[PDB]
Design a protein around this ligand. Structure first.
Ligand SMILES: Nc1ncnc2c1ncn2[C@@H]1O[C@H](COP(=O)(O)OP(=O)(O)O)[C@@H](O)[C@H]1O
Ligand SMILES: Nc1ncnc2c1ncn2[C@@H]1O[C@H](COP(=O)(O)OP(=O)(O)O)[C@@H](O)[C@H]1O
Ligand SMILES: Nc1ncnc2c1ncn2[C@@H]1O[C@H](COP(=O)(O)OP(=O)(O)O)[C@@H](O)[C@H]1O
Lengths: 723, 474
């Protein structure tokens, strides 16, 4: 069906003039590492770009940022017609003009601030009619190629002349502003966007299909997540990216309207969103309107909720829309809205993780001139509990800082600041430092899902166990066909045990990174927090946010905590079971054996655990993790000094023979102690830095042995029957 | 619809109902079906407000309002008894009740055949297979399943082929097929997210899964089979049938497989109240739920209300040592009230199991409650041979593998133990076929290597414990 017709998918190379294709695809069309291509799309338009090779690209697709996509008048998924074009010769004269609605405010030399560094020996293959976008000066300006000498298209060579009639052009109707929202404006939310897409794909892109297929398209999508996540943002970008109409409904907006006029706006809204369908009616603060819980008091209040349920179902189905909504949590809303037929589909958008926050920052700085010393990653790595918005405001209070110094002290009072100036202004890693430093980091923080930021390189020794872990998790998911071959059902989870500080936790994380799964750590104190408050009900809440994030490894640290608390050794008249541990057994048993959630329980006190968690069907496998041996010790030091100023003369294999009854934790202690000397040095001389030998040998002075030989044996006798 | 009428302005509400009934009497015979009943008539503590109150009354006057002359039937629906308002139960309105719990094995299967009876299913598609893995799935959860299962087989076939039209062709859709592989993806989604509540079902196991213990098997039928399939005789002599049994003995000997298998025999429902749930009530001081149970069991007869780890509450509170108090406790007590209350003449048989007879409240052994005490000892040389076969029935048993042999290798083992040794052989076999590729039939060198990590759950001390307990207990 013509191997010159592809499906436009998002891009990996953000450059305005690039369209990536797989290496095997470029061989079927016969194009090299730079062949200028001529792209053809709907609304009878064309564009010229540079083809490249992308491995992550399937032969069935062509990556292209939004500028490209827009100029063709296509949306992700459509069909376009590529074509080599080795006849485009260097242009002569190029007339480009800014668009009034992307300059209101800046003045001066546009040709110097934007245009110039843009084509600066870029040899960009533009066309007559294109609309490229240039960033810089804490903003983005859109230019429309009015006339190119080698019309219609030519390559921009350091010779080609460039005009700027300094008279901004109005925005043409069918020209969506590249200023609006799109998937390129959402960071860290991958798994989520994935789901949401295939959901609205067919219905919002291919209406007709349903005019003939007897299949019902999910009507309602509900978006979870705490305030800031960016539930709304996503919902809008979904519509702008599918061309679908978008009607926003704010919560207090409708609950502010006089009693009676309220049922009016909703009915009125829906009705009007059906008129421009396809569409996404996106309710903002759903819970402010529909929380029909114990909290349901009053006539107005009740009737309002009903008004919706009659409209949620009210979707004549004939109608062609999708109702997206958002809330702070399941319990906020009213159960009636979950009824299979309204908000049947749910998507959680928890806080951002390591890579997330980093991905976000690159989005909110993609317009300002960042300084060399600026370490974007650095920031992402210190903002443990930061939502999307908390990061945005961060860059704002971080740039406003680099402003109250540069052009502010220089001070350029005007009715409109110059653009050359703003492009010269730079924000330094030092300005961001000040941002965090403010009380702005006040980004709420709750239970955290993520990905393990550690590998097996951080785990010294214990190789025999490493592979064993993969035998319980790697095989059951990457070879499920075999597990049926024999019939036996995979173990539900493991239980690490042994002395404290031997990597029982590093293992639980590292194995999850291996399987690229989410990590969920329920630490001892949280088990106790529930235990003391008699709120073991929360346990259920956990297993859900785990199931709502498969693949995952629900991990329980200090599983013995509740026992030690209640006494442990002596204890009381009672026995092994207790309220929190019990609930986790109901959920661990309940939890569908056929899901993708693996439980790992760790304890440095196997001798007090409720023997019910070791029953088959729950935590079958019992794995013992002993202190480090002569070998492991050598690798542990290296693993805990990897990212440190290790002097050359320093002997590691040596210390491995100095210590014996040590655990990873102990060795680690001796390490920092060497560093607490090194920093005590460099800070002393100034008022020269590479941690050396005389440091460690002096750090052996205060060398301990967390694991006492008595206990040493304890685990030998426990790991007798336990084994 | 419920919110339909509770959405209408105050006043216009009493209008629609009256208006509705009136119009349903005009075309009679008819069924006036109220959807979300509970959202209009839950007149409970939650009864706050004028409009709210008056609306409920408006109905009661219309429920009775059925001139009887009129010729209609008012069907209604709700999530549970406690949701509604008691006034609606008055003998004359909603006097008849029907429960439609979740679907069971055969159910889900029957359903799927209904929502695929229109699409071209692939050969590899195993409809049953699905029904067997959707433990907690309602009707709708299964329907959407086929939708997200067909939409998947679509975003590949004619979608990648792309046939953009104001209307797709029919030859095409008839060629399109949904594969067992597309369904796999469905379940795989977060869609299974149905519900999971107090589960009633039928025993998916027979006596073929229970090795040895034949003497007991027939005994079970003597307590349940005779009293229902020959009730004419039980009156012949006068004696009243025992209300229930109490299995006991070491852990992992089939005390549970027996309780299930006997219910399959009588084709009855199975209801398993496991230890942790007894404790859940015990810790929350919510032993009130106990009553809720015995009901969903009387509203499901025939049935076997089975209580596992009935000893749980005892061990918890201490058991051996314990505290200043006695054998009774709040949860166990409530079950005695309900077990005594529960009409002797119904069709609900109680089975209580415990691997610790020595701590049970001796009141449950009183006549009228759990009279019969049956001891289930570990497996003998014979039983062991049959257990292996029973636990390897659906497995890649090599030919050269000797079963009668292992039966002489193990002694102090219980069904559970033998079972452990089994999977261990398999955890080697799968560790094999997975290692070569990167050929599959479980052989002998596997088991003999699986005897390495062979245990003995039942220790000889305890062994004797049940000998001395089963001395007076018998
Ligand atoms: N994941 C994200 N990617 C890019 N920007 C984000 C993200 N999360 C939050 N933001 C920023 O913070 C604001 C939060 O927006 P919004 O959609 O209204 O969130 P919420 O639904 O929690 O109220 C956005 O306008 C956006 O600029
Ligand atoms: N096997 C190991 N290899 C490298 N470092 C280790 C190892 N075991 C422990 N450590 C060090 O000691 C600390 C103890 O970590 P953790 O696994 O959480 O202890 P545990 O689980 O035994 O309570 C680690 O953060 C790490 O820096
Ligand atoms: N008599 C038996 N025949 C076949 N398998 C058995 C037998 N007894 C125990 N098993 C195996 O061990 C498990 C123990 O089951 P169960 O009846 O629940 O033990 P118990 O009630 O004594 O605690 C079974 O699911 C089964 O796999």
């Amino acid at each position: 069906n013509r191997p010159n017709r592809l499906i436009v998918d998002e891009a990996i190379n953000e450059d305005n003039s690039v369209v990536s294709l797989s290496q095997p695809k470029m061989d079927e069309l016969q194009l090299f590492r730079g062949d200028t291509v001529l792209l053809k799309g709907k609304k009878r338009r064309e564009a010229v770009c540079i083809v490249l090779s992308d491995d992550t690209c399937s032969d069935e697709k062509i990556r292209m940022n939004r500028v490209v996509r827009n100029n063709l008048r296509v949306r992700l998924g459509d069909v376009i017609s590529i074509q080599p074009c080795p006849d485009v010769k260097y242009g002569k004269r190029i007339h480009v003009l800014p668009i009034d609605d992307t300059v209101e405010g800046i003045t001066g030399n546009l040709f110097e601030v934007y245009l110039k560094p843009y084509f600066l020996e870029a040899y960009r293959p533009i066309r007559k009619g294109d609309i490229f976008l240039v960033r810089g000066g804490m903003r983005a300006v859109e230019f429309k190629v009015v006339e190119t000498d080698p019309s219609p298209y030519c390559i921009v060579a350091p010779d080609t002349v460039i005009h700027c009639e300094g008279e901004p052009i109005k925005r043409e109707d069918e020209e969506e502003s590249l200023n609006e929202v799109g998937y390129d404006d959402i960071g860290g939310c991958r798994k989520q966007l994935a789901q949401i897409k295939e959901m609205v794909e067919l219905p919002l892109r291919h209406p007709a299909l349903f005019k003939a297929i007897g299949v019902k398209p999910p009507r309602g999508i509900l978006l979870y997540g705490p305030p800031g996540t960016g539930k709304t943002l996503i919902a809008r970008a979904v519509a702008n990216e599918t061309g679908a109409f978008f009607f926003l409904i704010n919560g207090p907006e409708i609950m502010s309207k006089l009693a009676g006029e309220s049922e009016s706006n909703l009915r009125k809204a829906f009705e009007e969103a059906e008129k421009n369908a396809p569409a996404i009616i996106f309710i903002d603060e759903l819970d402010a309107i529909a929380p029909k819980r114990e909290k349901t008091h009053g006539e107005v209040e009740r009737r309002i909720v009903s008004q919706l349920l009659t409209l949620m179902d009210g979707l004549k189905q004939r109608a062609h829309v999708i109702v997206m909504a958002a809330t702070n949590r399941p319990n906020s809303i009213d159960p009636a809205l979950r009824r299979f037929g309204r908000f049947d589909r749910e998507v959680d958008i928890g806080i951002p993780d390591a890579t997330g926050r980093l991905e976000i920052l690159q989005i909110h700085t993609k317009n300002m001139k960042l300084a060399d010393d600026v370490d974007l990653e650095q920031v992402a790595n210190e903002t443990h509990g930061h939502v999307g918005a908390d990061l945005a405001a961060l860059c704002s209070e971080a740039a406003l800082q680099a402003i109250r110094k540069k052009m502010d002290l220089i001070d350029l009072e005007d009715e409109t600041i110059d653009a050359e100036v703003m492009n010269s202004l730079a924000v330094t890693m030092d300005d961001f430092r000040w941002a965090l430093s403010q009380s702005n980091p006040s980004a709420l923080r709750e239970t955290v899902v993520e990905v393990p930021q550690v590998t097996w390189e951080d785990i010294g020794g214990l190789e025999d166990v490493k592979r064993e872990l993969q035998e319980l998790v790697q095989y059951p998911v990457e070879h499920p066909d075999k597990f049926l071959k024999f019939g036996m059902t995979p173990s539900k989870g493991v239980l690490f045990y042994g002395p404290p500080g031997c990597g029982k936790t590093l293992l639980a994380k590292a194995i999850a990174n291996e399987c690229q799964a989410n990590f969920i750590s329920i630490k001892g104190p949280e088990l106790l927090t529930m235990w003391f408050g008699e709120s073991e009900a929360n346990v259920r809440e956990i297993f859900d946010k785990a199931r709502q994030a498969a693949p995952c490894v629900l991990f329980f640290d200090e599983l013995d905590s509740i026992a030690k608390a209640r006494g442990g050794n002596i204890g009381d008249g009672g026995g092994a079971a207790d309220r929190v541990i019990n609930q986790i057994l109901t959920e661990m048993d309940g939890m569908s054996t056929k899901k993708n959630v693996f439980i790992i329980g760790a304890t440095n006190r196997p001798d007090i655990i409720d023997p019910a968690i070791l029953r088959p069907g729950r935590l079958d496998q019992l794995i013992y993790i002993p202190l480090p041996d002569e070998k492991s010790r050598v690798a542990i030091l290296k693993a805990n000094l990897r990212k440190s100023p290790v002097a050359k003369d320093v002997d590691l294999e040596f210390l491995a023979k100095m210590t014996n009854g040590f655990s990873g934790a102990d060795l680690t202690e001796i390490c920092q102690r060497a560093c607490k000397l090194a920093i005590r040095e460099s800070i002393e001389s100034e008022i020269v830095p590479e941690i050396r030998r005389d440091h460690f040998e002096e750090a052996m002075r205060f060398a301990r042995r967390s694991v006492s030989d008595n206990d040493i044996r304890k685990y030998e006798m426990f790991a007798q029957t336990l084994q």
